[PDB]
Amino acid sequence: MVISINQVRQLYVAKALKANTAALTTAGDIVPKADTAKTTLYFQSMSPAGIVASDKINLKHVLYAKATPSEALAHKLVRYSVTLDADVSATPVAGQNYILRLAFRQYIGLSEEDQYFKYGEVIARSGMTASDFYKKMAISLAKNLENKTESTPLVNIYLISAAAASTDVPVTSATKESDLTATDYNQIIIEETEQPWVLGMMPQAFIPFTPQFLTITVDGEDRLWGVATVVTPTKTVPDGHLIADLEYFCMGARGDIYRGMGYPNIIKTTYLVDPGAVYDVLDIHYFYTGSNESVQKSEKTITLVAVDDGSHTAMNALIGAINTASGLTIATL
Amino acid sequence: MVISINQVRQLYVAKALKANTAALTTAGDIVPKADTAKTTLYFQSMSPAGIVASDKINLKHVLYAKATPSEALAHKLVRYSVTLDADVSATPVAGQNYILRLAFRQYIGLSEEDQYFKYGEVIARSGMTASDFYKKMAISLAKNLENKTESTPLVNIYLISAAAASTDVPVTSATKESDLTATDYNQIIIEETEQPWVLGMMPQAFIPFTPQFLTITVDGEDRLWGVATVVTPTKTVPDGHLIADLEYFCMGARGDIYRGMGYPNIIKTTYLVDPGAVYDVLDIHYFYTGSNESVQKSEKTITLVAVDDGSHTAMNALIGAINTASGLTIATL
Amino acid sequence: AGKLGKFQMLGFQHWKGLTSDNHLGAIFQQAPQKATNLMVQLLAFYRGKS
Amino acid sequence: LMGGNTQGVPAERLQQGERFSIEFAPVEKELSRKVGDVRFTSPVSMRNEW
Amino acid sequence: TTIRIQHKVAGNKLNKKLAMGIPMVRNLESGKQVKDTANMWMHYVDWEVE
Amino acid sequence: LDTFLNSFPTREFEDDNEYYWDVIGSSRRNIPLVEARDENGVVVAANAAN
């Protein structure tokens, strides 16, 4: 995850909090250090290879210091709710083929020009019901979108029973109309699915989609049967994978930039971020200005990430520490 | 840490023990599977990338199946004890240069033809007792050896007093004769150190030494003053830093043998073992024999590493499972 | 059995007997090939320059 | 909001997913200060076996 | 007196080339590692057996 | 000090890029011992019988 930097960015994992430079026993222990006359601030961190300190922060040249919670970084997955238009017809047409189209916007390549379309076709029948049509439509999408041969996950598709009205019924390529025993299906949800991830090689990305419809003859005129609607998301990709790449990136400023170039002849960097966790982040923006002519600023950032137990204890304790040592006020989250 | 293989060795980590294949959710989780007839045995481990299964163990082709505890793989740091041989004299003889010589056998070059000699010297004075010699000799040794100038950590110099006789007070290049205030010092023990480790690049190794001595004159006789005698060790290098490379090697059979050679274009492997914890091991050696003319065996190993902190609870539970499933009688440790 | 300098990246690796490919990979003698007559330009109707 | 907008912009246009593109960096005729910036991208690779 | 030796190798080692991530070495009688250009694996197997 | 330095040769690199070199070592070894056990799996104790 290559990012933009305001001339530098540096990261320190606050696994623990020790209150003294003496108590820095294990990696990830961090202490905020500021003199009584609050003019400088820095952090003594315990590295896999010994103690280490961060650049000193002039409490006069600090621009913004803010803590961001884990949920702020959790990508809510876009989910649509496609139903058939009660205007055209509240029920399927006897002998029409309903072909739903899912145009995917950012496919393998970065650009919006890298398009990819997936279809779900359902030829309706006399006596067919709406629930039965949603059933078959979702199953067709499953075979096309939730198949196992697809190179990359594309979308999740569900079903909702009016009786439930909130529970989403998964519909996978193994599912079959015998397993979907209901008659009050209202809609078809199509949700965004998390793409893969690799530290330093595949950043956390997504591929978005819009559902498009083809036109059916309802009396004698071509018309669209469906209305695609965006409803509140309910799934979120957690922060663990972003912070990890952030550390994989921001530790090359404090150290080795040749992360792996030179395979036998390299210098491995041990990391302290577990991508299976949820960290709250804290960023401080500050600068250095020189003397009598070197007034040009050098804006800099020092980021601290702490795991969230659900109530932001590690960070709130870290905030109290920095605030009582620096006189700052960083608005505990 | 390239190891020797009896036609292959495989390793499967056990971070959790489950009862069924439907409970394998988190990676590292493992379960042993065997038909009720106890004719085959195989393991279902949850890989980071999904469920996976071990090779099949023909239960009547089992050669040996034995476990190993953490305390049987921790290298014990060997340590001598240096003193004044009471035959020559039990007190320092004024005016004589006591030049100790630590010879190091396996220094950089991985051999015994790669020798390295560090020294330590002391000139004795009239009122110098044995306690004063031991400390001054210790500080002299610390300066030369405890060098952070040195590219390697070679030895740890400690002292012992007749009062404690077990508590070893340490002597670093920082200490000074004013910090060592005891009047009853008896010896100078010298441990060997752990060296720096890097999985796949720097295997766990040690530098062995013997404290030779030089000759003082006493009555016109060239005579050695000291006697180095090994003592029962007290400290051990734990296992984690060794299992980590075991599976780093035993994963390239299951997976990618190019564990990084064209760095960008690789299949990065996720390793579940923490190189900072201790593990008990369980090796199952067996073979595959063929039909009519193909009786030539093909021996195989199935290594299993289960974190065992304190009592060997995890591996004991694992063993009870394999013995209940396969009817084997592996011994619990 | 130690570091000559402090920027010594490797240690001496040694084994006995039957040598597998992962033995040769763990000693950095097995590497993927690069096909240069093989390249994939993603397919798209690039409507920039329009 | 540039362009003459004095009514505002509705929230329907300011929800998750709204796609934004870079138009240009306008500046004053006299006494204008630094604006704008430049950006880059990287390719990828794939692999096979036998 | 009588003496035996043996070394087993898989068949794939017939004309196996080495990537030479790190230089490939040829143990000598003196005990001195030496740098060798040979890219094949049996060159070295032969040497060590003799 | 200037003269002292001049007593050493200079080498022209091409950039400020970190560099490395291959260091060749030795081969002749003898293996330490962890412990010895009886025919029943009991260890020696440095004071036991032959």
**And the tokens for B71?**
């305390």
The CA distance from B268 to B26, in Å, is 19
* 8 Å CB contact between A285 and A63: yes
**And the tokens for A83?**
């139903």
**And the tokens for B226?**
């000291």
* 8 Å CB contact between B252 and B1: no
* 8 Å CB contact between A314 and A280: yes
Residue appearing with tokens 């898989």: E10
The CA distance from A89 to A228, in Å, is 15
Return the closest-CA partner of residue B44 out of B75, B71, B69, B23: B23
The CA distance from B226 to B320, in Å, is 54
CA–CA distances in Å: residue B171 to residues A112, B146, B176 = 66, 9, 8
* 8 Å CB contact between B210 and B104: no
What resolution in angstroms, rounded to 1 decimal?
A: 3.0
Collapsing DSSP to helix, strand or coil, A134 comes out as helix
- Name the helix (H) or strand (E) containing B323: helix B313-326
SS3 percent helix, strand, coil of chain D, rounded to 5, is 5, 0, 95
Chain E neighbours (≥3 Cβ pairs under 8 A) are A, B, C, F
Strands A298-307 and A279-288: antiparallel
Return the closest-CA partner of residue C34 out of B68, B210, A137, B263: B263
**And the tokens for A149?**
């041969």
* 8 Å CB contact between A73 and A275: no
Strands B279-287 and B62-68: antiparallel
With a CB cutoff of 8 Å and minimum separation 6, the contacts of B249 are B1, B2, B3, B200, C22, C26
The CA distance from C15 to C25, in Å, is 13
Write the DSSP assignment of F1-50 as a string of letters: -HHHHHTS-----SSS---------B----------B-TTS-B--SSS--
**Phi, then psi, of B203 in degrees rounded to 5:** -75, 160
The CA distance from A221 to A164, in Å, is 36
Strands A116-123 and B62-68: unpaired
Cβ neighbours of A103 (radius 10 Å): 14
- Deposited experimental method: cryo-EM
Name which of A265, A266, A267 to mutate to probe chain F: the one with the most chain F Cβ atoms within 10 A of its Cβ. Answer: A265
- Measured in angstroms, the CA of A270 and the nearest CA of chain C are apart by 14
Residue appearing with tokens 């752990």: B194
Contact list in E for residue C27 (CB cut-off 8 A) is: 21-22
* 8 Å CB contact between A76 and D16: yes
**Least CB–CB distance from D17: residue in A2, A78, A110:** A78
Write the DSSP assignment of A255-306 as a string of letters: S-S-SSSSTTS---------TTS-EEEEEEEEEE--STT----EEEEEEEEE
Return the closest-CA partner of residue B272 out of B119, B46, B67: B46
R_g over Cα of chain B: 27
Are A258 and F20 a contacting pair at CB < 8 A?
Answer: no
Cα B322 from chain centroid?
28
**And the tokens for A78?**
């876009």
Asked whether at least 3 C-beta pairs link D and F within 8 Å, the reply is no
The CA distance from B91 to B172, in Å, is 24
Count Cα atoms within 13 angstroms, Cβ side, for A7.
9
The CA distance from D27 to F37, in Å, is 85
